[PDB]
Design a protein around this ligand. Structure first.
Ligand SMILES: CC(C)(COP(=O)([O-])OP(=O)([O-])OC[C@H]1O[C@@H](n2cnc3c(N)ncnc32)[C@H](O)[C@@H]1OP(=O)([O-])[O-])[C@@H](O)C(=O)NCCC(=O)NCCSC(=O)C[C@@](C)(O)CC(=O)[O-]
Ligand SMILES: NC(=O)c1ccc[n+]([C@@H]2O[C@H](COP(=O)([O-])OP(=O)(O)OC[C@H]3O[C@@H](n4cnc5c(N)ncnc54)[C@H](OP(=O)(O)O)[C@@H]3O)[C@@H](O)[C@H]2O)c1
Ligand SMILES: NC(=O)c1ccc[n+]([C@@H]2O[C@H](COP(=O)([O-])OP(=O)(O)OC[C@H]3O[C@@H](n4cnc5c(N)ncnc54)[C@H](OP(=O)(O)O)[C@@H]3O)[C@@H](O)[C@H]2O)c1
Ligand SMILES: [Ca+2]
Ligand SMILES: [Ca+2]
Ligand SMILES: [Ca+2]
Lengths: 358, 425
């Protein structure tokens, strides 16, 4: 019955059964998100978590000014972003891509190559079925983009689906498309077995690279601008050597990125999973940014998979997500990813500069 | 050309900088400079967290993000029943956690440690092996200064516990500090302790140079491992319980071969873990950072859980570093954190980490069972049909009736769910 009760009835049941105090109940009742919206978004809803939201300052991306909504519970995070962006002055997009990835995994595959060669010769029909399983995205101008195949040891075979989901995160688009094609596969190969069909959150085809060039004089109010830069460069390289520093290094970056992702109603677990997994380069967890000295300029670069969204999920139904989107005022998801990647690099600059200046 | 940033438009210099203004003044300035609409300003003004609390926690505060919070059910850890506060915006996460916990019935602790790491890193070290030995013999005084740099923790029963040393590139040296921060996360306890020990490191060695002294979020000494044992019959409403178990084992095994699946595998785990971390006012970045880095094993990003078959039993196990906290940070200054803490009803941070790890394993179970059984979509659409019913006003047993009819529709809507509801009345 608990999952069938109203929020008001669930709180009363919790109090009646001694599971929460009376003051705890009154606090759970002090909400600002409409009960209608919250109760229909999740299950067993009783209340809300309120995260303070502030405005990150001085971010410029490709000669466009931005005001960054940042939801965070940690002090100094928004100030660090603002000081880091002010010092950097601007950020420039080195390259951007935006495709989502999914997979259908066969198991107990007798001869992998046989199965794979079978699929490659019928790719036209697969694209046909993928359109039928979600035709709306194809009308918007997206849809399936490529098919890839990977044969693994232990008799696994993965069919990789790369999709253009436009401004959505794409989970429900990709999952629907994959389950529809899975049916066709089971019709084509009654012999074979399908372990699962699901989207991959490792969005290596949604990577964004930002960069910044900083006159070393801006790194200090005084004369030791180059000294601070040389130590920033040293700190960044040590992240490539000590995972115990790289994790803190990337955590500092995600303080800014996850604040914007949260404020705009995007999925924080998805972005945190892809970014940290993308940090694994050459079998070692390293930093997501590089800092080098080219003459009298400190040059920083960031590369992160940012399959973010401006539509779908919680980006619209939560009024605060719409308000944060009004403040940021990005026109599409690709732009959101560029702004978020710049926030990451700005956060990292403020963190390293403070780390080596003390 | 290169004009300045549009923020220097927000200052009221005829009087005040943005970071000095009050939240109300900061919103008025935002509206007057064309950055937000009137409706957006009013929505920002609709807040439940005290303005005095929010404004003094962060900088340039203007409003708040509201994440719905629900209650996960059926979780049992070490023969104790729990009600898990879960803060999330994703549908089905809480229902899946309840389903996964119900299927497993309970979780037990295999091992647990709780120590926060810190590091003081030397750079430009000529002979690393020399400086190291020069430090190992003076550990008696290193432990003493650590106590005076932050004595409060030592009288509460904690403080520095161990010192280890590593060298990289034959030019870097790192002094590793293992600290017991009790129920706090330990960031400010460690940092202050390390910056104080760095001082005498300079006094001792005017020859060497320190690059930085700071905590490490990679809390490999806060790993907690949870276990579960499920009769295969509980994995299906039908008769193929074992078949399902066999598929879950392979899905878990496949995660260990394809990082593209492992990331999604751990993402599902973190849907539950981060939802409790957020509800209790803990630092979500620190947990996801240490958890995903811990996922890297033998030079390969893999799944954080293992699933194996032992006779008629499906055996699941999770291992993650959870340096969570029950005090400090945002665990108390945020009233909702205290309310969520009253519901979870844990006594210490060690118990918090144990419950959160179990939540992760239960979450993993629900996802994997659905993926290898009917698929992830069927469950989602069903919850979506019920949500669309309550939106239009479905009550009582009309919730399932309207959801049943929405299933028949090729495309479910709020426009059509209202039509179904009115006919029933
Ligand atoms: C969604 C269910 C639970 C449907 O549930 P069902 O299969 O129809 O079975 P049921 O309705 O008879 O009851 C299932 C139990 O789940 C709970 N439950 C059931 N319905 C509700 C509800 N309305 N409100 C609250 N709780 C609910 C409830 O505890 C219930 O038992 P009971 O308490 O009644 O004895 C099932 O399909 C399921 O578990 N799906 C898993 C979906 C999931 O894991 N979602 C997480 C977000 S998606 C994700 O993780 C991404 C992913 C999957 O890609 C990660 C990965 O790949 O690993
Ligand atoms: N593996 C995973 O991690 C996983 C698994 C399951 C669920 N999820 C969750 O599923 C959600 C993300 O998936 P989703 O975005 O596809 O949900 P969605 O809300 O159903 O899809 C996007 C919505 O935005 C609309 N839209 C408007 N303009 C669009 C545009 N330019 N491009 C694309 N769509 C546009 C779409 O309309 P049309 O239908 O007409 O196209 C659609 O209704 C998140 O809540 C996520 O956390 C994640
Ligand atoms: N790299 C990073 O992640 C990083 C860096 C810097 C800061 N931070 C932030 O710093 C905060 C976490 O650090 P913190 O935990 O040390 O915050 P904290 O609030 O300063 O420390 C814990 C507080 O709880 C009190 N307390 C009561 N009972 C305790 C117990 N059993 N054990 C420990 N403390 C107890 C302590 O009293 P006493 O004062 O007497 O000791 C202290 O005031 C977070 O806001 C975090 O995001 C993170
Ligand atoms: Ca191809
Ligand atoms: Ca605007
Ligand atoms: Ca030792």
């Amino acid at each position: 019955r608990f999952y069938q009760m109203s929020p008001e009835e669930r709180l009363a049941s919790l109090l009646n059964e001694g599971q929460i105090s009376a003051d705890t109940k009154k606090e759970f009742e002090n909400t600002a998100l409409s009960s209608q919206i919250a109760n229909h978004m999740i299950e067993n809803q009783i209340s809300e978590t309120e995260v303070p939201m502030g405005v990150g300052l001085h971010l410029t991306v490709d000669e466009t000014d931005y005001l960054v909504p940042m939801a965070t519970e940690e002090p100094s995070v928004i100030a660090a972003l603002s000081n880091g962006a002010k010092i950097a002055q601007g950020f420039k997009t080195v390259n951007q891509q935006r495709l989502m990835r999914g997979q259908i995994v066969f198991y107990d595959v007798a001869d992998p190559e046989s199965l794979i060669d079978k699929l490659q010769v019928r790719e036209a029909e697969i694209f046909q079925q993928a359109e039928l399983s979600y035709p709306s995205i194809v009308k918007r101008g997206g849809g399936l983009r490529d098919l890839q195949y990977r044969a693994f040891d232990e008799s696994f075979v993965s069919v990789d689906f790369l999709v253009d989901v436009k401004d959505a995160m794409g989970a429900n688009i990709v999952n629907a498309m994959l389950e529809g094609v899975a049916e066709l596969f089971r019709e084509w190969f009654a012999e074979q077995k399908i372990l699962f069909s699901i989207l991959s959150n490792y969005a290596t085809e949604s990577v964004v690279t930002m960069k910044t060039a900083i006159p070393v004089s801006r790194l200090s109010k005084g004369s030791n601008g180059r000294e601070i830069a040389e130590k920033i460069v040293l700190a960044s390289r040590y992240a490539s050597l000590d995972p115990y520093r790289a994790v803190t290094h990337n955590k500092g970056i995600m303080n800014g990125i996850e604040a914007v992702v949260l404020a705009t109603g995007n999925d924080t677990r998805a972005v945190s999973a892809s970014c940290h997994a993308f940090a694994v380069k050459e079998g070692r967890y390293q930093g997501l940014t590089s800092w080098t000295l080219d003459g009298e300029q400190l040059i920083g670069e960031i590369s992160v998979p940012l399959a973010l969204a401006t539509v779908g999920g919680a980006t619209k139904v939560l009024p605060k997500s719409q308000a944060a989107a009004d403040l940021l005022a990005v026109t599409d998801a690709k732009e959101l990813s560029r702004v978020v990647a710049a926030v990451g690099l700005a956060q990292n600059l403020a963190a390293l500069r403070a780390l080596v200046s003390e």
